[PDB]
Amino acid sequence: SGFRKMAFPSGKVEGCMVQVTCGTTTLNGLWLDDVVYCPRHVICTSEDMLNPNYEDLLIRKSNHNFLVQAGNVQLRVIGHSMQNCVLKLKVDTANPKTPKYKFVRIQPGQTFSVLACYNGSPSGVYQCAMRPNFTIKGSFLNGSCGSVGFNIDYDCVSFCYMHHMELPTGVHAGTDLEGNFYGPFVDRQTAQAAGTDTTITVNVLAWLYAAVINGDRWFLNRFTTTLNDFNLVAMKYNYEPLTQDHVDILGPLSAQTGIAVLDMCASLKELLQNGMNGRTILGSALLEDEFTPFDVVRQCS
Amino acid sequence: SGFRKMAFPSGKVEGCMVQVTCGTTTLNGLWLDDVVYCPRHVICTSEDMLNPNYEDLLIRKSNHNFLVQAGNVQLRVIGHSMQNCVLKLKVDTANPKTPKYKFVRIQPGQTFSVLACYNGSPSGVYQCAMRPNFTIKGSFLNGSCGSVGFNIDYDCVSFCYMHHMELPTGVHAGTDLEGNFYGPFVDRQTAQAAGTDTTITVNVLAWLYAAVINGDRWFLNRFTTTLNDFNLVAMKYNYEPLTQDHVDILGPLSAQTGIAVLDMCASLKELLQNGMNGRTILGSALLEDEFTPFDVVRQCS
Ligand SMILES: COc1c(F)c(F)cc(C(=O)O)c1F
Ligand SMILES: COc1c(F)c(F)cc(C(=O)O)c1F
Ligand SMILES: [Cl-]
Ligand SMILES: [Cl-]
Ligand code: NA
């Protein structure tokens, strides 16, 4: 028993991390088969980042303009190409430590592990949720760009995120591994802010199931409710609407505890209205919304 | 910026994890050079749970009673010995993935990464602290025994914990890698319970310094305290005594922020008296005590 924010084991990804340098800019690359993926903004000087023309800046450069280092070994760059906001560098050598992998795009509410990296060196790992406003609440310093987010399904690593920038509120923005931004963001030094965020309703209910599975049961009650009724309370508290798809994904947890989702929604309803009454749930004073139903089932059995 | 419960990259530990079987009992082991370390209670059977005589149970085993498995490979055990509560199994092969390692016994308040493993396969990674009552608040199901806790400071893996058992209150007890328990616990199913736990005072202050570095000042006050007056107030909230050693260790964080340790101590006294009044600190509505001064400087500016 016990319940913790838990990252995937990060070794399959540590084996793919390289350092990429172009001029004065150093950041991280992902080395899979014979290609190194990194953010395209690596080709920009400071001046360039105010209004960058990436087509024009890029056709200027050549393969030998890119220094790729896997530990203490220079990789030879024999090709370079842009795909959306991600730069692809072909190299003479396939990564002998390439795992089974695919590129995947995640939905808001879904979680992934981030391998925070500096100068190509894995530094730390933590779990994040793609916020409804398409930011993540990460921990990144200068040199972290090109750090990546991933899930593991059996032996296959699904890469879903690459780090590009920090916003003024201290939250973070990036792309999938095909260079498409999550959220209404651009890779340029201009004025950008996160939309107002909402709470991931189905994740809070998953976390309450986790509490109950772990003998934390005070918040429970004899009451039940309806989607319509709860959703009117939800919208009032900047909670995501709860759908019949969400209720169906929580089925297993509703079974394993004998508390029905609207049974549990009744508990969440009263927690938003009344508060926590000086108590904690799983050692938090907040309603935690960064555990998916999968996360709970995976960790608890 | 940002601030996250962040674990060490687990790859160097992943390539060390194996499955150990004895009788009907399977748990995890740690393969470094030609030695596999696991909890000694692997040799216990159905009746040997209450008062196992380990010297008697071990002398009756040959090397071939131990079935050790690195994924698909069956290692051959060629030797066996007990050191305190750890079994040390010699095998005919050094682990090719053995990294630079060392064993260290930690003190209460110290943090580490846990690589949770089932059947020798890594399941996830998370950060824990050694509580003042010598337990950890982990996430461990049946089969996790032999999972290890570690730090990775400057490419060397310091092993500091091996998981042995869950106590009746849902908290976790284990040994250093020399097989000596943290706390007054023993590898028997006799009734045991942890001492009253206390908040890790030095770590709360380190986290408040983290909040200030990340631009939060709302909880500071114009007051200071003596170290003695601070301790008389702090022990009434079940906080650990703050020692001169703790004050010295905060010196660098004091320096970076321009806030004296005893000033920050007055802020802590006030937060304990008022609560948060619907505010949060680094995304928590509680005072977090599982980040050390070292962890705050690692993750921060
Ligand atoms: C005969 O009494 C015992 C006993 F002392 C013991 F440690 C374990 C068992 C058991 O079968 O689980 C048992 F029956
Ligand atoms: C899961 O196996 C057990 C177990 F049930 C138990 F009560 C105690 C120990 C131990 O090492 O002290 C153990 F490994
Ligand atoms: Cl452009
Ligand atoms: Cl220590
Ligand atoms: Na209910």
Write the DSSP string, B189-205. -S---PPPP-B-HHHHH
A82 CA from centroid of ligand 2 (Å):
55
According to DSSP, residue A7 is labeled B
Residue with the two structure tokens 């928590």: B284
Q: How far is B59 from chain A (nearest CA, A)?
A: 34
From first CA to last CA, the distance across chain B in angstroms is 8
Q: At what angle do helices A293-300 and A201-213 cross, to 10 degrees?
A: 20
Calpha distance B104→B153 (Å, rounded)? 12
Q: In a mutagenesis test of the A interface, which of B8, B10, B148, B282 is the best target, namely the one with the most A β-carbons within 10 Å?
A: B10
Whether B146 and B54 have beta carbons less than 8 Å apart is answered as no
Q: Is A64 a catalytic residue?
A: no
The 10 Å CB-count burial string (b at 16+, else e) for B233-245 is: bbeeeebbebeee
Please name the helix (run of DSSP H) or strand (run of DSSP E) that holds residue B3, with its range, or none.
none
Whether B83 and B176 have beta carbons less than 8 Å apart is answered as no
Residue with the two structure tokens 């790992």: A125
Calpha distance B8→A125 (Å, rounded)? 6
**Longest CA span, chain A:** 69
Q: How many CB pairs under 8 A join A and B?
A: 119
Whether B30 and B19 have beta carbons less than 8 Å apart is answered as no
Residue B102, C-beta contacts closer than 8 angstroms, at least 6 positions apart: B156, B157, B158, B159
Calpha distance A91→A95 (Å, rounded)? 10
- Chain B residues with CB-CB distance to A141 below 8 A: 1, 301
**CATH 1.10.1840.10 domain position(s) in chain A:** 198-301
Residue with the two structure tokens 């004073």: A285
B47 lines ligand 1 (CB under 6 A): yes
Pocket test for ligand 1, best of B41, B44, B45, B47 (most atoms within 8 A of CB): B47
Please name the helix (run of DSSP H) or strand (run of DSSP E) that holds residue B30, with its range, or none.
strand B25-32
**CATH 2.40.10.10 domain position(s) in chain B:** 1-14+100-197, 15-99
- Chain A residues with CB-CB distance to B215 below 8 A: 170
Whether B113 and B8 have beta carbons less than 8 Å apart is answered as yes
Calpha distance B241→B72 (Å, rounded)? 50
Calpha distance B180→B153 (Å, rounded)? 23
CA-based nearest residue to A66, from A88, A95, A94:
A88
B61 CA from centroid of ligand 2 (Å):
19
A125 CA from centroid of ligand 1 (Å):
44
Calpha distance A4→B138 (Å, rounded)? 7
Residue with the two structure tokens 């760059």: A77
Please name the helix (run of DSSP H) or strand (run of DSSP E) that holds residue A172, with its range, or none.
strand A172-175
According to DSSP, residue A242 is labeled P
Calpha distance A100→A59 (Å, rounded)? 33
Residue B263, C-beta contacts closer than 8 angstroms, at least 6 positions apart: B220, B223, B224
Nearest ligand 2 atom, CA B173: 12
Tell me the C-alpha to C-alpha distance, in Å, between residue B299 and each of A142, A172, B277.
Answer: 12, 16, 27
Evaluate whether the domain defined by B1-14+100-197 bears CATH number 3.40.1080.10.
no
Q: At what angle do helices A261-274 and A227-236 cross, to 10 degrees?
A: 30
Helix (H, G, I), strand (E, B) or coil at B143: coil
> Which residue has the CA at smallest separation from atom 13 of ligand 1?
B47
HEC per residue, B84-135 = CCEEEEEECCCCCCCCCEEECCCCCCCEEEEEEEECCEEEEEEEEECCCCCC
φ/ψ of B120, rounded to 5, equals: 75, 5
CA-based nearest residue to A198, from A231, A160, A240:
A240
Minimum-distance ligand to the CA of B294? 4
Q: How far is B3 from chain A (nearest CA, A)?
A: 5
Rg (chain B; Cα; Å):
22
CATH-assigned architecture of domain A198-301? Orthogonal Bundle (1.10)
Question: Are A124 and B3 inside 8 Å of each other by CB?
Answer: no
Question: Are B124 and A166 inside 8 Å of each other by CB?
Answer: no
B240 lines ligand 2 (CB under 6 A): no
Question: Are B10 and A125 inside 8 Å of each other by CB?
Answer: yes
A180 CA from centroid of ligand 3 (Å):
14
Number of neighbours of residue B190 by Cβ within 10 angstroms: 8
Whether A179 and A161 have beta carbons less than 8 Å apart is answered as no
Task: Walk across the sheet containing A17-22 and list its strands.
Answer: A73-75, A67-70, A17-22, A25-32, A35-39, A86-91, A77-83
Question: Are B7 and A125 inside 8 Å of each other by CB?
Answer: yes
The structure was resolved experimentally with: X-ray
Rg (chain A; Cα; Å):
22
Please name the helix (run of DSSP H) or strand (run of DSSP E) that holds residue A265, with its range, or none.
helix A261-274
B35: exposed, middle or buried (Cβ count in 10 Å: 0-12, 13-18, 19+): middle
Whether B207 and B292 have beta carbons less than 8 Å apart is answered as no
Pairing type for strands A156-166 and A101-103 reads parallel
Whether A136 and A148 have beta carbons less than 8 Å apart is answered as no
B51 lines ligand 1 (CB under 6 A): no
Calpha distance A89→A39 (Å, rounded)? 11
Strands (E), A167-266: 172-175
HEC per residue, A133-157 = CCCECCCCCCCCCCCEEEEEECCEE
Which string of DSSP letters, residue by residue, matches B148-208? EEEEEETTEEEEEEEEEEE-TTS-EEEE-TTSPBSSS--SS-S---PPPP-B-HHHHHHHH
According to DSSP, residue A234 is labeled H
B299 lines ligand 2 (CB under 6 A): no
Quote the Cα angle for A207-A208-A214, to 5°. Answer: 90
- Chain A residues with CB-CB distance to B276 below 8 A: 285
**In the beta sheet, which residues pair with residue B89?**
B36, B80
Q: How far is B61 from chain A (nearest CA, A)?
A: 32
Question: Are A2 and B125 inside 8 Å of each other by CB?
Answer: no
Calpha distance A287→B243 (Å, rounded)? 35
Question: Are A126 and B5 inside 8 Å of each other by CB?
Answer: yes
From first CA to last CA, the distance across chain A in angstroms is 10
Calpha distance B260→A77 (Å, rounded)? 52
Resolution in A, one decimal? 2.0
CATH class name, domain B15-99: mainly beta
B172 lines ligand 2 (CB under 6 A): no
Helix (H, G, I), strand (E, B) or coil at A226: coil
Calpha distance B125→A11 (Å, rounded)? 11
Across the interface, of B14, B15, B139, the residue whose CB is closest to A4 is B139
> Which residue has the CA at smallest separation from atom 9 of ligand 2?
B165
Helix (H, G, I), strand (E, B) or coil at A230: helix
- Chain A residues with CB-CB distance to B128 below 8 A: 4
Whether A87 and A40 have beta carbons less than 8 Å apart is answered as yes
Which residues of B carry out catalysis? 41, 145
Nearest ligand 2 atom, CA B39: 11
Tell me the C-alpha to C-alpha distance, in Å, between residue A197 and each of A169, A289, B164.
Answer: 12, 12, 42
Q: How many residues does chain A have?
A: 301
